[PDB]
Design an enzyme around this catalytic site. Structure first.
Site, PDB file in Angstrom:
ATOM      1  N   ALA A   1      57.142  52.953 -38.114  1.00 16.16           N
ATOM      2  CA  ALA A   1      56.296  51.903 -38.370  1.00 16.16           C
ATOM      3  C   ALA A   1      55.125  51.898 -37.301  1.00 16.16           C
ATOM      4  CB  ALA A   1      57.251  49.865 -37.743  1.00 16.16           C
ATOM      5  N   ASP A   2      53.551  50.549 -38.062  1.00 11.12           N
ATOM      6  CA  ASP A   2      53.008  51.226 -37.419  1.00 11.12           C
ATOM      7  C   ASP A   2      52.253  49.644 -36.651  1.00 11.12           C
ATOM      8  OD1 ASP A   2      52.744  50.433 -40.468  1.00 11.12           O
ATOM      9  OD2 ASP A   2      50.915  49.535 -40.032  1.00 11.12           O
ATOM     10  N   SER A   3      51.392  48.356 -37.183  1.00 19.40           N
ATOM     11  CA  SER A   3      51.627  47.932 -36.971  1.00 19.40           C
ATOM     12  C   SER A   3      50.958  46.132 -37.872  1.00 19.40           C
ATOM     13  CB  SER A   3      50.203  47.179 -35.951  1.00 19.40           C
ATOM     14  OG  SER A   3      49.005  47.541 -36.978  1.00 19.40           O
TER      15      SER A   3
END
Ligand SMILES: CCCCCCCCCCCCCCCCCC(=O)OC[C@H](CO[C@@H]1O[C@H](CO[C@H]2O[C@H](CO)[C@H](O)[C@H](O)[C@H]2O)[C@H](O)[C@H](O)[C@H]1O)OC(=O)CCCCCCCCCCCCCCCCC
Ligand SMILES: CCCCCCCCCCCCCCCCCC(=O)OC[C@H](CO[C@@H]1O[C@H](CO)[C@H](O)[C@H](O)[C@H]1O)OC(=O)CCCCCCCCCCCCCCCCC
Ligand SMILES: CCCCCCCCCCCCCCCC(=O)OC[C@H](CO[C@@H]1O[C@H](CS(=O)(=O)O)[C@@H](O)[C@H](O)[C@H]1O)OC(=O)CCCCCCCCCCCCCCC
Lengths: 85, 127, 49, 50
Positions: free
Chosen positions: A38-40
């Site tokens: 997962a990123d931001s």
């Protein structure tokens, strides 16, 4: 008041798993959120999914400092704790 | 038990809203009311999905504009502002000032204070 | 709350009747008041039964 | 050989019976589905919230 952190933790883990596509026994109670795929702009989608699952509102500053599924579960448990008062 | 004495004001507007509400509650059969209820629920669910998509797109755009603003490395946004946008806690002036502040100085962690709750409008015996 | 919710929706003319025990502590104070009657008459007034 | 064709042509003529009886059974299913909404638990939840 008296909240069962066990059930909350179970369901937070389930929601994270179902959201990212990772199997439930891989997301550890201390696994952070970037290492699990997962990123931001995806830690906010799982925040939205958490609110939708528990039907509560997350405090925003406390949501700026979420890094481990344990702290997420703890924030949610604190929200549900102070509901009637 | 706790009704704020501002919801029991007798005005010229409330004595016609009474007719409307009494139609809805006594002059309509509960079955049609139920069907309308289901339709309204479905519509509101779709509206919420649309609003969530729009909020996500807004966070992208603001993360993109803070780059031009600060010029350098920050591609970041604030989860604070995303949540505050999803719960309708900002006045339009606040989001405008925030866009300007991002586009000019970055500072993606400097947010408008908060929107305060709207009170119930009263005029006189009128409404 | 369940009683009121039932009466206001009309679903109270088709429920099986009920029995309820209202225990009140022994009161021999100088008062002529009794909160059994008070609570039940307040329930009969809120619903206009 | 014979009995199969016979039961087949009776199948087709009772399909005919069904074609001359489609709107009635259709509206019967419609009124049944309408009367099906107002006996769930959803409808009593709705009545209590009302
Ligand atoms: C075509 C489908 C309509 C079939 C039907 O029976 O059409 C007529 C229906 C009336 O349907 C009635 O609908 C009733 C609905 O009752 C339910 O809802 C009622 C509240 O309205 C009461 O609560 C009642 O207790 C509860 O069972 C019952 O199903 C009756 O059996 C049924 O005749 O009206 C309608 O569709 C509404 C007409 C709108 C015209 C404007
Ligand atoms: C669109 C309708 C505009 C009014 C929306 C106001 C919403 C709001 O909160 O605004 C945001 C802020 C109000 O700010 C609110 O103030 C409140 C104080 O009671 C509380 O503090 C709220 O938290 C704060 O958000 O608006 C302004 O500060 C003024 C904006 C003026 C908007 C009217 C423009 C239309 C006037 C045209 C006339 C031009 C003639 C020359
Ligand atoms: C002739 C009319 C003259 C009017 C002149 C212009 C008035 C402008 C409109 C007034 C502002 C609305 C006030 C308000 O929202 O109150 C709350 C009202 C209900 O009134 C409230 O309703 C309450 C009971 S309840 O909500 O219906 O259950 C009750 O607390 C309260 O007494 C009652 O005021 O909520 C409504 O749904 C009003 C929406 C429609 C108003 C816009 C139509 C424009 C006309």
């Amino acid at each position: 008041a008296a909240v069962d952190k066990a059930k909350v933790l179970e369901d937070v883990r389930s929601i994270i798993s179902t959201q990212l596509g990772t199997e439930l026994e891989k997301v550890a109670p201390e696994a952070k959120f970037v290492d699990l795929g997962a990123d931001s702009l995806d830690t906010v989608e799982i925040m939205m999914a958490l609110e939708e699952k528990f039907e509560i509102a997350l405090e925003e500053e406390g949501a700026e400092k979420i890094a481990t599924v344990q702290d997420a579960a703890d924030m949610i448990a604190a929200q549900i704790a102070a509901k009637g008062n | 038990t706790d009704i704020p004495w501002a919801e029991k004001r007798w005005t010229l507007f409330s004595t016609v809203w009474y007719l409307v509400q009494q139609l809805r509650f006594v002059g309509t059969p509960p079955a049609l009311r139920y069907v309308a209820f289901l339709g309204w629920r479905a519509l509101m669910f779709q509206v919420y999905a649309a609003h969530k998509a729009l909020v996500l797109w807004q966070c992208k755009l603001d993360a993109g504009l803070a780059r031009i603003g600060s010029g350098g490395a920050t591609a970041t946004f604030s989860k604070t502002m995303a949540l505050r946008r999803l719960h309708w806690r900002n006045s339009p002036l606040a989001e405008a000032l925030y866009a300007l502040n991002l586009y000019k100085t970055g500072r993606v962690h400097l947010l408008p204070p908060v929107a305060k709750p709207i009170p119930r409008p009263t005029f006189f015996w009128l409404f | 709350g369940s009683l009121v919710c039932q009466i206001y929706s009309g679903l109270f003319n088709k429920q099986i009747s009920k029995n309820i025990l209202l225990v009140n502590p022994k009161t021999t104070s100088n008062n002529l008041v009794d909160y059994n009657v008070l609570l039940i008459q307040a329930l009969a007034g809120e619903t206009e039964m | 050989p014979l009995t199969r064709a016979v039961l087949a042509v009776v199948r087709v003529r009772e399909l005919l019976r069904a074609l001359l009886l489609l709107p009635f059974s259709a509206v019967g299913g419609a009124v049944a589905a309408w009367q099906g909404l107002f006996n769930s638990q959803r409808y009593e939840n709705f009545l209590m919230s009302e």
